């Protein structure tokens, strides 16, 4: 839903990396959050929300 609420503005490379990490684990550690942010150059808050949102896609109810 990146057509109504603008915020998940990421790049193919960034999403690819994040997706790779998510494939291994739907969660995120402190070190991973800060590492991913520093590695790709994104806000830890954005990464955290991205993972939380990605997890909601699988587990509905």
UniProtKB/Swiss-Prot annotation:
TM regions (residue ranges): none
Effect of mutating residue 57 to Q: Reduced specificity and affinity for DNA
PTM field: Phosphorylated. Phosphorylation may directly or allosterically modify its function.
Cellular localisation: Nucleus
DNA-binding region (UniProt annotation): 3-61
Function: This protein specifies the body segmentation pattern. It is required for the development of the central nervous system. Transcriptional regulator that represses activated promoters. Wg signaling operates by inactivating the SGG repression of EN autoactivation.
Entry's family note: Belongs to the engrailed homeobox family.
Protein name per its UniProtKB record: Segmentation polarity homeobox protein engrailed
Protein source organism: Drosophila melanogaster
Gene: en
Residues included from the entire protein: 453 to 512 of 552
